[PDB]
């Protein structure tokens, strides 16, 4: 559903509302949302 | 007889009782700590 990233081992995975907030690989409890699908534009000024 | 616990005392960063006092240069970067940060302060909430 929503892409996340493990703050320790960088494994990517998804979570729905119900699951606990941890990394499946190492059990790290600090995680970060992945970059959005949309394209970003900047004017280079 | 058994050791009793009276509470928790906030530790001044980079003092002798802080977990950063050791580590050395190689590990400090892994703990996301900046080597220019000289401590002398506490972390409360």
């Amino acid at each position: 559903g929503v892409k996340y990233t493990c703050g320790a081992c960088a494994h990517n995975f998804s979570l729905n509302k119900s699951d606990p907030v941890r990394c499946k690989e190492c059990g790290h409890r600090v995680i970060y949302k992945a970059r959005t699908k949309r394209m970003i534009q900047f004017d280079a000024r | 007889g058994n050791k009793v616990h009276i509470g928790k005392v906030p530790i001044m960063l980079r003092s002798k009782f802080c977990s950063l006092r050791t580590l050395d240069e190689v590990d400090l970067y892994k703990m996301k700590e900046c080597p220019y940060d000289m401590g002398g302060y506490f972390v409360i909430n």
């Binding site: 990233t5 703050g7 960088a10 970060y32 | 970067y29 892994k30 996301k32």
Partner: protein, 66 residues
């Protein structure tokens, strides 16, 4: 943070001369002479290279989050 592309004051490109400047310092040249060899004659251009501080080498030491 990283060497500016242009001199702020006059606009001459200086972002391609940073690597050449560090190499000249290993060979023992003095800062004034190194700038002279690179043909940076106006002192507006000279401040850019002489006084830049390369912090990006420090920021890269932090292990990639991803």
């Amino acid at each position: 943070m990283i060497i500016p592309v242009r001199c702020f004051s006059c606009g001459k490109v200086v972002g391609d001369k940073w690597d050449a400047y560090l190499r000249l310092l290993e060979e023992g040249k003095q800062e004034g002479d190194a700038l002279d060899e690179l043909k940076l004659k106006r002192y507006c251009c000279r401040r850019m290279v002489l006084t830049h501080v390369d912090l990006i080498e420090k920021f890269l030491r932090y292990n990639p989050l991803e």
